[PDB]
Write an enzyme that holds these catalytic residues in place. Sequence first.
Site, mmCIF file in Angstrom:
data_model
loop_
_atom_site.group_PDB
_atom_site.id
_atom_site.type_symbol
_atom_site.label_atom_id
_atom_site.label_comp_id
_atom_site.label_asym_id
_atom_site.label_seq_id
_atom_site.Cartn_x
_atom_site.Cartn_y
_atom_site.Cartn_z
ATOM 1 N N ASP A 82 7.636 5.850 5.675
ATOM 2 C CA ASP A 82 6.783 4.635 5.131
ATOM 3 C C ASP A 82 7.212 3.449 5.775
ATOM 4 O O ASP A 82 8.068 2.946 4.949
ATOM 5 C CB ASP A 82 6.797 4.832 3.800
ATOM 6 C CG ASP A 82 5.807 3.780 3.352
ATOM 7 O OD1 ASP A 82 5.070 2.901 4.103
ATOM 8 O OD2 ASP A 82 5.280 3.976 2.213
ATOM 9 N N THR A 83 6.815 2.946 6.976
ATOM 10 C CA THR A 83 7.470 1.823 7.426
ATOM 11 C C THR A 83 7.131 0.469 6.443
ATOM 12 O O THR A 83 7.634 -0.668 6.778
ATOM 13 C CB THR A 83 7.203 1.516 8.931
ATOM 14 O OG1 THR A 83 5.737 1.421 9.130
ATOM 15 C CG2 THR A 83 7.825 2.488 9.766
ATOM 16 N N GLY A 84 6.097 0.716 5.874
ATOM 17 C CA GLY A 84 5.683 -0.503 4.986
ATOM 18 C C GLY A 84 6.279 -0.622 3.670
ATOM 19 O O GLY A 84 6.070 -1.348 2.606
HETATM 20 C C1 LIG Z 1 1.126 6.547 -1.502
HETATM 21 C C2 LIG Z 1 2.006 6.042 -0.354
HETATM 22 C C3 LIG Z 1 2.316 4.689 -0.204
HETATM 23 C C4 LIG Z 1 2.891 3.968 -1.575
HETATM 24 C C5 LIG Z 1 1.007 3.790 0.413
HETATM 25 N N1 LIG Z 1 1.112 2.541 0.478
HETATM 26 C C6 LIG Z 1 1.799 1.845 1.855
HETATM 27 C C7 LIG Z 1 3.356 1.492 1.565
HETATM 28 O O1 LIG Z 1 3.745 1.318 2.829
HETATM 29 C C8 LIG Z 1 3.275 0.209 0.760
HETATM 30 C C9 LIG Z 1 2.803 -1.255 1.568
HETATM 31 C C10 LIG Z 1 3.136 -2.256 0.792
HETATM 32 C C11 LIG Z 1 2.256 -2.379 -0.721
HETATM 33 C C12 LIG Z 1 2.624 -3.812 -1.449
HETATM 34 C C13 LIG Z 1 3.356 -4.562 -1.063
HETATM 35 C C14 LIG Z 1 4.153 -4.433 -0.019
HETATM 36 C C15 LIG Z 1 4.043 -3.244 1.009
HETATM 37 N N2 LIG Z 1 4.841 0.148 0.432
HETATM 38 C C16 LIG Z 1 5.242 0.189 -0.674
HETATM 39 O O2 LIG Z 1 4.543 0.287 -1.798
HETATM 40 O O3 LIG Z 1 6.587 -0.049 -0.890
HETATM 41 C C17 LIG Z 1 7.213 0.060 -2.233
HETATM 42 C C18 LIG Z 1 8.591 0.550 -1.887
HETATM 43 O O4 LIG Z 1 9.195 -0.400 -1.221
HETATM 44 C C19 LIG Z 1 8.898 -1.725 -1.685
HETATM 45 O O5 LIG Z 1 8.668 -2.693 -0.566
HETATM 46 C C20 LIG Z 1 7.071 -2.877 -0.500
HETATM 47 C C21 LIG Z 1 6.678 -2.865 -1.797
HETATM 48 C C22 LIG Z 1 7.616 -1.715 -2.496
HETATM 49 S S1 LIG Z 1 -0.228 1.278 -0.347
HETATM 50 O O6 LIG Z 1 0.155 -0.135 0.272
HETATM 51 O O7 LIG Z 1 -0.073 1.756 -1.730
HETATM 52 C C23 LIG Z 1 -1.738 1.880 0.397
HETATM 53 C C24 LIG Z 1 -2.241 1.503 1.670
HETATM 54 C C25 LIG Z 1 -3.339 1.962 2.098
HETATM 55 C C26 LIG Z 1 -4.070 2.762 1.547
HETATM 56 C C27 LIG Z 1 -3.616 3.372 0.223
HETATM 57 C C28 LIG Z 1 -2.469 2.913 -0.243
HETATM 58 C C29 LIG Z 1 -4.246 4.637 -0.533
HETATM 59 C C30 LIG Z 1 -5.614 4.679 0.640
HETATM 60 C C31 LIG Z 1 -5.448 3.674 1.899
HETATM 61 O O8 LIG Z 1 -5.477 4.183 3.100
#
Ligand SMILES: CC[C@H](C)CN(C[C@@H](O)[C@H](Cc1ccccc1)NC(=O)O[C@H]1CO[C@H]2OCC[C@H]21)S(=O)(=O)c1ccc2c(c1)CC[C@@H]2O
Lengths: 99, 99
Positions: free
Chosen positions: B25-27
């Site tokens: 998860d690069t995000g």
């Molecule tokens: C379940 C798998 C993951 C959690 C799915 N996420 C994508 C992750 O990369 C998120 C991105 C992000 C969100 C908010 C703020 C910054 C970055 N990162 C994340 O939460 O990181 C945590 C851990 O580290 C910390 O740094 C960043 C925040 C903290 S999501 O954004 O919830 C998502 C996107 C699309 C879609 C969905 C769900 C559902 C359908 C649609 O396709």
Amino acid sequence: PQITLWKRPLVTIKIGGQLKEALLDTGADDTVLEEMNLPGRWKPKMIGGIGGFIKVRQYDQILIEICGHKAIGTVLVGPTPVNIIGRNLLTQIGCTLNF
Amino acid sequence: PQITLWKRPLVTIKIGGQLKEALLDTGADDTVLEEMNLPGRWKPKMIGGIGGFIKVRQYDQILIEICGHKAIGTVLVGPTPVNIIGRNLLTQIGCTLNF
Ligand SMILES: CC[C@H](C)CN(C[C@@H](O)[C@H](Cc1ccccc1)NC(=O)O[C@H]1CO[C@H]2OCC[C@H]21)S(=O)(=O)c1ccc2c(c1)CC[C@@H]2O
């Protein structure tokens, strides 16, 4: 290009005639953009992650340019804290993970 | 390997001696795993995602192997919807984005 992950993989994108910064996010199935007033039809949707769900508007066949690479697909618009480029568009620009 | 993004980038990991599946998860800044028993002291922490904030247990300097590549770093344990490997560990295995 090659993007290391020491810092957040933020890139400039172009959508709806606007330039924005967005994360290249291999953990997102689909693209989620911060609140913006896009024209056209949309469908309500709920997307879940850490902390719970947010309500978003699903727009289809939206054109986005990511680092000069054109892509077209579904864009979810809602109260996300960050612009997220998800796999539906990352595949279109030729993006891969490598280690 | 080179990993395309037409499917979720899911990999097998080992932590605490147990195998699990996790999402590259690069995000994600941080690595967050679903509730589990991990040996070692921990400290209460908060982390925010797309839907709000959650309470997690922070384990420091934890051994974890990802797709055959060893890392030692911070693992957060809590009510995440999915096991996610974040940039703190992706950097250790040499992971980059490429397009
Ligand atoms: C379940 C798998 C993951 C959690 C799915 N996420 C994508 C992750 O990369 C998120 C991105 C992000 C969100 C908010 C703020 C910054 C970055 N990162 C994340 O939460 O990181 C945590 C851990 O580290 C910390 O740094 C960043 C925040 C903290 S999501 O954004 O919830 C998502 C996107 C699309 C879609 C969905 C769900 C559902 C359908 C649609 O396709």
